Design a protein around this nucleic acid. Structure first.
Ligand SMILES: [Mg+2]
Ligand SMILES: [Mg+2]
Ligand SMILES: [Mg+2]
Ligand SMILES: [Mg+2]
Ligand SMILES: [Mg+2]
Ligand SMILES: [Mg+2]
Ligand SMILES: [Mg+2]
Ligand SMILES: [Mg+2]
Ligand SMILES: [Mg+2]
Ligand SMILES: [Mg+2]
Ligand SMILES: [Mg+2]
Ligand SMILES: [Mg+2]
Ligand SMILES: [Mg+2]
Ligand SMILES: [Mg+2]
Ligand SMILES: [Mg+2]
Ligand SMILES: [Mg+2]
Ligand SMILES: [Zn+2]
Ligand SMILES: [Zn+2]
Ligand SMILES: [Zn+2]
Ligand SMILES: [Zn+2]
Lengths: 129, 151, 48, 61, 196, 57, 229, 89
RNA sequence: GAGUGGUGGCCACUAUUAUUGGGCCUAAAGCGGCCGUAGCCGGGCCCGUAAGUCCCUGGCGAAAUCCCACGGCUCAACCGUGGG
RNA sequence: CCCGGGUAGUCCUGGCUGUAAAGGAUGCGGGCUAGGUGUCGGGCGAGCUUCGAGCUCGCCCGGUGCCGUAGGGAAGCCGUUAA
């Protein structure tokens, strides 16, 4: 059965970008997926996106630009402290500032660079590069 | 997929997204409640009442009208019946499954060698136990209520 | 075969049990812990 | 596009041949549809779309 | 309006497709007849012919190559090469013609015209490896893989191929300035088609 | 100064040194240069001219 | 460098080109090595590389990776054939790998060297290590992967002065390409030299498949082709 | 547990017979007139330690890191291995 | 090189114990098939709580042992003063 | 091994035994990733018709086969019925 809407969205995106699709539809929407999409758009990985209302949980429509090498979810959502971002970067990313880790903190969802600037930790939920 | 047969049927209803009742619908809420009570007194099941309303009176699902008493929730057939004391004591699907199991058991008394039909009985009783556990958790059944075929 | 299991966040006990269970299939580990060589060695662990 | 599911059935306004009454019915009934006044049959159920024996006036939205 | 009257197109049988179809060809399909046979849209054919006529006129005349394995297309490509000065290879395509410098007739063009991607698979395969633009005539059955400019038409009939190549030759001549008007081209269409 | 790496017209990605890409002037206008990468050619992705707006393989 | 200038001049005049690209090079319309890549040309004449990259003929810019002899069985005995795997490069930004066969060793070596030139590629270099951020093209700019047969190779950026932490075949191939420091991880059968070399070659080639932004070019000091001081 | 045991201050090669390494070390030994290989190895280890301290401090941050960074630079240029205006790189 | 060899043990080699990070058509390896209890994993929105989780700050986790700079034995090994 | 005979067994009723190359040598649930072409069940549209629960063509859903793109693999090969 369905267990993780967020993982399906990122796997769908990375599958679609490899065959040059220009847009995708994320089927079960949620606030968390919206936040992740906002963060991804801020750094220029995706184009514009919009929310479409059906009688069910709603759909997301996303424009792709062919600027993503890989995107995935992190399970389990490990907790991370404010000064331990380096080893996770080595575990998931290819260079010392290549891509972003997405962190859920008590102040919202943000990339690990902003969180390190604010000096706070949280839970890792995804990576994009 | 299906619970036991693992097939992947997709047939079902495709309800369009709408909030307010359509303009061409002319009945009011009170007329709908009267119709529901009348049909229930005719002896129909909850699922059948909605079918009759849709087919003959041109009323799509009654879940288009706000509940006049409680503004926070929409109106459903079971709530309408509860407001007048005609609600079933046992949830309808559990009652239907139990009724199916009783009829099958008296068949297997005359046909002890029908092993392929017996597996159907086992699956039916598994469904019954799942449902009774769920209903006990939510408080729709007394905690001492038990399903015994020997009854 | 599906994804390797268990992967859940609160599944430490089962994961540890699985790893302990399948470590006995390793002959080097089994001989060391049960001390099988010492039981049959005519030199009784001496080098000479 | 077709992301939002849309039904293929319709609600119809029909007129009874005998009584002259007008009703609104469903195009895919699962029961026999009869006039609310005279009781005559209006639509016969089938595997899919029903068979209409009355006069069609309008196809509602 | 049109290069030739639509009656001439229909008489030549350009619009007639086959019993099969492809997803990427549906942008050109007009409708499907009651016998299960698909029909092409003629206006798209005319527009693409005009565009292709403009496109081919910018190349050096002798660096254009046209090929045809099918019997009905051998005469039209030969006549087309004779009129426009482009090289034409009818019949069997010798493997290694464009990839093996030791062959006696080694030749590297700048643009190639494919009569049928299915039949001329060897020529297309060799043209892919040298990175030149590809112009092809496509029917309802073909795919558009590795095709840079597509001309929707029936590519199996005799009169159809004759008419298509006649039109294309006239368009090239007009665009490159060797004739001052369309009507000046005094060569009958029947001279492009194989007899008997 | 350095040299600029060509970019596919359809997908916008860079062209690798030894792939089966192609480039040609715009058939309709003849003023712009269209580049097609190997993947776009294989999958028959449509392209659109930046000057005249004419589109499609 | 003076010797190779006159060598290229000497080769250019007495050469009769047979292909379109050879004609372009002979007429002087193409003058730099980087102009023959990324546009789908076919490369079939070795003299092109000799004119454009003369220093690949230096004895110090060539490497004989391996030599083997294989047997075909016939009713009149065993027929022996030689397989030679070789590689060339300019130690700056270009590298090629090749295989040649022959009845005797010298013929196989000549053919292998010849085929290496035709398979020439250019790569990207930089510095992307966490513990060395110097913007100088001494390593791979980011982690890359390649594979061939059963062999999988992963290349990881390293600090300056570390050395080449990889097997000897990888050492030679990376040295011919102009890389000084790297970390690596492998899976599969590395004792199969041909697959190991091809996997390293593919890993180097894949540096062109990673999407990048103008900021990353400045941050990692990415260089394509020659360093150009 | 176990009490302290004093450890060697140099590291031996991973493989005793590599032709290129032997040639390079022979050149160094002949030029600077050392007695035995271990002496040479000692100096090599020193170099490595310096590098290993520089690699660790580049990727660090905080208050102690700055102190150790300036201490490393001061010690290195006190020995005469660096000019007065050198930086960590 | 005042050392250099032999035998036995542990780690590495080894992604041959695999959380990071392995396998199960034909090479070792998917129960003959299914139902289901504990366990593990679990759809969308709103309100509350603050156990997990994150940040700040008090009291602790002896000395010796480890890392760094300076100082004393000729330098060093060793020892002392400070910072971790 | 081939030929002429032949007991148990093979068949029915009530129990026990629980084994096969019991093999798709491929555990089960969910999301996504080019196409082409047969056939079985239901539904929808159009055209014929001897008016048949009939015939032909197109589309949707679910089963059951073959060829094949990206990708995968030591290869044989698998490839929306995924390995
Ligand atoms: Mg013989
Ligand atoms: Mg392979
Ligand atoms: Mg003790
Ligand atoms: Mg060993
Ligand atoms: Mg293994
Ligand atoms: Mg099984
Ligand atoms: Mg089995
Ligand atoms: Mg949930
Ligand atoms: Mg708490
Ligand atoms: Mg202490
Ligand atoms: Mg002193
Ligand atoms: Mg001192
Ligand atoms: Mg002390
Ligand atoms: Mg069987
Ligand atoms: Mg199917
Ligand atoms: Mg296949
Ligand atoms: Zn009536
Ligand atoms: Zn592209
Ligand atoms: Zn244009
Ligand atoms: Zn560096």
């Amino acid at each position: 059965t369905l267990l993780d809407p967020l993982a399906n969205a990122l796997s769908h995106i990375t599958n679609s970008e490899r065959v040059g699709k220009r847009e995708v539809y994320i089927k079960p929407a949620s606030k968390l997926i919206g936040e992740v999409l906002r963060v991804m758009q801020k750094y220029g990985y995706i184009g514009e996106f919009e929310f479409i209302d059906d009688g069910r949980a709603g759909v997301y429509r996303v424009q792709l630009l062919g600027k993503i090498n890989k995107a995935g979810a992190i399970k389990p959502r490990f907790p991370v402290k404010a000064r331990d971002y380096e080893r996770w970067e080595k575990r998931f990313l290819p260079a010392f500032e290549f891509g972003i880790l997405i962190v859920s903190t008590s102040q919202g969802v943000m990339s690990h660079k902003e969180a390190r600037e604010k000096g706070i930790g949280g839970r890792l939920i995804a990576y994009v590069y | 997929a299906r619970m036991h047969a693992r097939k992947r049927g997709k047939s079902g209803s495709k309800r369009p997204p709408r909030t307010a009742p359509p303009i061409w619908l002319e009945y009011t809420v009170e007329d709908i409640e009267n119709l529901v009570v009348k049909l229930r007194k005719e002896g129909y099941s909850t699922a059948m009442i909605g079918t009759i309303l849709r087919d003959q009176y041109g009323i799509p699902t009654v879940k288009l009208f706000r509940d006049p008493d409680n503004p926070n929730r929409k109106l459903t057939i079971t709530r309408i019946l509860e407001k007048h004391g005609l609600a079933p004591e046992i949830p309808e699907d559990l009652m239907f499954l139990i009724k199916r199991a009783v009829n099958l058991r008296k068949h297997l008394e005359q046909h002890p060698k029908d092993l392929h039909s017996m597996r159907g009985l086992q699956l039916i009783e598994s469904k019954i136990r799942r449902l009774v556990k769920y209903y006990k958790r939510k408080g729709k059944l007394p905690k001492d209520w038990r399903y015994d075929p020997e009854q | 075969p599906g994804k390797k299991a268990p992967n859940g966040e609160f599944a430490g006990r089962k994961l540890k049990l699985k790893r302990k269970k399948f470590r006995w299939s390793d002959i080097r580990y089994k001989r060391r812990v049960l001390r099988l060589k010492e039981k049959s060695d005519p030199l009784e662990g001496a080098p000479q | 596009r077709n992301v939002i599911p849309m039904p293929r059935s319709r609600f119809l306004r029909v007129k009874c041949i005998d009584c002259g009454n007008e009703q609104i019915v469903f195009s895919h009934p699962a029961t026999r549809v009869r006039c609310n006044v005279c009781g005559a049959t209006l639509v016969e159920p089938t595997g899919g779309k029903g068979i209409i024996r009355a006069k069609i006036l309008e196809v509602l939205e | 309006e049109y290069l030739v009257p639509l009656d001439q197109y229909l008489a030549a049988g350009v619009h007639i497709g086959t019993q099969q179809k492809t997803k990427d060809m549906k942008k050109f399909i007009y409708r499907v007849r009651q016998d299960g046979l698909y029909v092409l849209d003629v206006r798209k054919t005319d527009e693409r012919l005009k565009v292709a006529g403009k496109f081919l006129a910018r190349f050096d005349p002798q660096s254009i190559l046209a090929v045809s394995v099918r019997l009905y297309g051998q005469k039209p490509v030969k006549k087309f090469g004779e009129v426009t000065g482009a090289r034409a290879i009818p019949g069997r395509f010798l493997p290694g013609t464009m990839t093996n410098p030791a062959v006696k007739n080694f030749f590297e063009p700048d643009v190639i015209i494919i009569t049928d991607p299915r039949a001329d698979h060897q020529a297309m395969k060799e043209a892919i490896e040298i990175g030149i633009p590809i112009v092809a005539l496509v029917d309802t059955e073909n795919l558009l893989s590795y095709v840079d400019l597509a001309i929707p038409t029936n590519n199996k009939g005799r009169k159809a191929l004759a008419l298509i190549y006649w039109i294309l030759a006239r368009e090239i001549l007009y665009n490159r300035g060797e004739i001052s008007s369309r009507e000046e081209f005094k060569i009958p269409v029947e001279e492009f088609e194989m007899k008997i | 100064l350095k040299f600029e790496i060509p970019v596919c017209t359809s997908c916008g990605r860079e062209i690798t040194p030894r792939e089966h890409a192609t480039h040609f002037v715009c058939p309709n206008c003849g003023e712009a240069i269209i580049w097609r990468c190997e993947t776009c050619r294989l999958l028959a992705k449509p392209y659109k001219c930046p000057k005249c707006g004419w589109e499609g393989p | 460098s003076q010797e190779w200038k006159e060598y290229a001049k000497r080769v250019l005049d007495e050469w009769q080109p047979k292909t379109k690209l050879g004609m372009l090079v002979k007429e002087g319309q193409i003058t730099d090595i980087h102009e023959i890549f990324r546009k789908g040309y076919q490369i079939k004449e070795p003299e092109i590389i000799d004119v454009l990259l003369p220093e690949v003929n230096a004895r110090e810019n060539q490497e004989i990776l391996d030599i083997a002899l294989t047997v075909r069985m016939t009713d009149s005995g065993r027929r022996v054939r030689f397989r030679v795997l070789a590689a060339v490069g300019n130690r700056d930004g270009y590298v090629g790998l090749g295989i040649g066969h022959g009845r005797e060793v010298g013929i196989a070596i000549r053919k292998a060297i010849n085929y290496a030139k035709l398979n020439i590629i250019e790569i990207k270099r930089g510095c992307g290590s966490w513990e060395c951020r110097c913007r100088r093209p001494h390593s791979v700019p980011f982690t890359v992967e390649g594979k061939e047969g059963s062999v999988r190779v992963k290349l990881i950026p390293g600090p300056r002065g570390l050395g080449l932490v990889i097997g000897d075949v990888g050492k030679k191939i990376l040295r011919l390409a102009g890389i000084q420091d790297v970390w690596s991880q492998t899976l599969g059968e590395t004792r199969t030299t041909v697959n190991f070399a091809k996997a390293v070659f593919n890993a180097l080639y894949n540096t062109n498949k990673v999407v990048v932004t103008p900021e990353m070019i400045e941050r990692y000091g990415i260089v394509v082709g020659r360093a150009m001081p | 547990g176990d009490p302290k045991r004093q450890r060697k201050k140099y590291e031996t090669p991973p493989h005793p017979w590599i032709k290129e390494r032997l040639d390079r070390e022979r050149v160094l030994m002949d030029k600077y007139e050392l007695k035995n290989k271990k002496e040479l190895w000692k100096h090599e280890t020193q170099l490595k330690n310096f590098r290993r301290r520089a690699r660790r401090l580049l990727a660090a941050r905080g208050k102690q890191a700055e102190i150790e960074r300036e201490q490393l630079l001061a010690r290195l240029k006190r020995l005469g291995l660096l000019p007065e205006d050198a930086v960590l790189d």
